[PDB]
Amino acid sequence: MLQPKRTKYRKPHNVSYEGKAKGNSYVAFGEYGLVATKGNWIDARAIESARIAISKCLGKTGKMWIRIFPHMSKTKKPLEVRMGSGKGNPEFWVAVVKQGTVMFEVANIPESQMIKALTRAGHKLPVTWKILKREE
Amino acid sequence: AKKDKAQQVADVSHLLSTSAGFVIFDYTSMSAIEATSIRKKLFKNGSKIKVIKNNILRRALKAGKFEGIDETAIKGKLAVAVGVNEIVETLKAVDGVVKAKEAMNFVCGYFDNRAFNSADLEKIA
Amino acid sequence: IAKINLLGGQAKPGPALASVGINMGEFTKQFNEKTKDKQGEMIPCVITAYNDKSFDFILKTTPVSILLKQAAKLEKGAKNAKTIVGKITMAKAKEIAQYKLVDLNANTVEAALKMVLGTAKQMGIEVI
Amino acid sequence: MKVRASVKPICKDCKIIKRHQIVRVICKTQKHKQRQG
RNA sequence: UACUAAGUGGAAAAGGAUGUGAAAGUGCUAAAACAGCAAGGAUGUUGGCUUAGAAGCAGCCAUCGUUUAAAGAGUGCGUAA
Ligand SMILES: [Mg+2]
Ligand SMILES: [Mg+2]
Ligand SMILES: [Mg+2]
Ligand SMILES: [Zn+2]
Structure with missing residues (x-):
């Protein structure tokens, strides 16, 4: 579970996922990458599921990079509570994924395992994923 | 590619031009263990069994300015058994082996700038 | 059969x-x-x-690679291919080849020579 | 027969067909019959 | 002038599919293409640890080489093997 060690403000305003791609747009560490086609809020739980999926379907020498990180937190008012009396408490951490951000990349193992590995990582995420390669 | 095919047809045509005896066989029901046995029993560089393409064999035959072998290489499975110097002992050896086999056909061949029939192959041994 | x-x-x-x-x-x-x-x-x-x-x-002849062990003067070969323990010269290799020529279906004796290297690579013995 | 929202071949022998405007998977092994693709 | 065969039109997602049309590349082909059919489809050997046993198809030590058109320490089934 990726989580910031400390934050200046417990309850920040939510960060929109509507828009184009700011950074993390092109594969630059590996050479195959999992691009998104639909901006959405995905939490650290989905990252851990996807990362564990990649590691289980990886080999003995494959290497991976996680680009996105859940910087922003979100709150949730307790159940059966009427509106008012302040904002709720932080519950889960979410990374802001915009349309076009490369979430996972893999390298150093043959192409078929890498294509399969990215597929299982993207089935764990709500965004509509797509495979891309690194420019020569 | 085309250049390799051109090279292949040229060298097989040269080999059949400098050779003296040829006989055609089929590849129906004999084992690879048996195939290695035929190679060792011959053991002569003049005698050589080879799988040739039907198309490549006819085209090399056109370059060999021979005639009449066309009926052999039509709608059939073709082997090449080239013999240098003495070919009677090679034909005798292959005839003994097909008798030791279960079933076999045997198609007309070419030797001494003359052609033979099926019965003429039976007596050529 | x-x-x-x-x-x-x-x-x-x-x-x-x-x-x-x-x-x-x-x-x-x-x-x-x-x-x-x-x-x-x-x-x-x-x-x-x-x-x-x-x-x-x-x-039929006894299976191969036991005379390789005998000639290498070791009971069991290395558990890693990269790790090299036994060394075998051409003279011991050729004695095995002429011994094992009976069961082999190779036409020539150099083919049987490189059979000894082939099973020795599996065995891990350097061919010297 | 297994009714699933997604149908894919299980073994290399499984073959996808489209019968009565429905895609199904047929194979020698009857444990691998799928429908409602 | 084209497209759709779903009454889609005339409500929906993640996911799945030899539905169909258009386009842009690349491989082979009348020196014969692809599918199917007819044949072969190997030897050391059943390599060796290993496992009651594996030895073409348990984990391995790896992932051999010749003959040859081709053949794999095998493609599965399968055999205690
Ligand atoms: Mg409707
Ligand atoms: Mg489709
Ligand atoms: Mg289309
Ligand atoms: Zn099946």
Whole structure:
């Protein structure tokens, strides 16, 4: 579970996922990458599921990079509570994924395992994923 | 590619031009263990069994300015058994082996700038 | 056709043969008669199982890579291919090749030479 | 027969067909019959 | 002038599919293409640890080499093996 060690403000305003791609747009560490086609809020739980999926379907020498990180937190008012009396408490951490951000990349193992590995990582995420390669 | 095919047809045509005896066989029901046995029993560089393409064999035959072998290489499975110097002992050896086999056909061949029939192959041994 | 495993000094048992109709008791003498030159060594037999009943049998050489162990002066080879322990020269390799030429289907003796390297690479023995 | 929202071949022998405007998977092994693709 | 065969039109997602049309590249082909059919489809050997046993198809030590058109320490089934 990726989580910031400390934050200046417990309850920040939510960060929109509507828009184009700011950074993390092109594969630059590996050479195959999992691009998104639909901006959405995905939490650290989905990252851990996807990362564990990649590691289980990886080999003995494959290497991976996680680009996105859940910087922003979100709150949730307790159940059966009427509106008012302040904002709720932080519950889960979410990374802001915009349309076009490369979430996972893999390298150093043959192409078929890498294509399969990215597929299982993207089935764990709500965004509509797509495979891309690194420019020569 | 085309250049390799051109090279292949040229060298097989040269080999059949400098050779003296040829006989055609089929590849129906004999084992690879048996195939290695035929190679060792011959053991002569003049005698050589080879799988040739039907198309490549006819085209090399056109370059060999021979005639009449066309009926052999039509709608059939073709082997090449080239013999240098003495070919009677090679034909005798292959005839003994097909008798030791279960079933076999045997198609007309070419030797001494003359052609033979099926019965003429039976007596050529 | 059956490739059956029978000891050279003890080949009288074996019920599987009896299922095909082979005359086991008459043929026991034939099994033991031509293996006394290699007593103690384990020698399997190929059987031309058929209904003619005149079953022609052929003996067979003990499996390879045990003389490699004997020549390498070690009991068991390395558990890692990269790790090299045994070394074998061309003279020991060629004695094995002319020994094993009988069971091999190679036409030439250099083909049998590079058989020794091929099983030695599996065994991990450097070819020097 | 297994009714699933997604149908894919299980073994290399499974073959996808489209019968009565419905895609199904047929194979020698009857444990691998799928429908409602 | 084209497209759709779903009454889609005339409500929906993640996911799945030899539905169909258009386009842009690349491989082979009348020196014969692809599918199917007819044949072969190997030897050391059943390599060796290993496992009651595996030895073409348990984990391995790896992932051999020749003959040859081709053949794999095998494609599965399968055999205690
Ligand atoms: Mg409707
Ligand atoms: Mg489709
Ligand atoms: Mg289309
Ligand atoms: Zn199936």
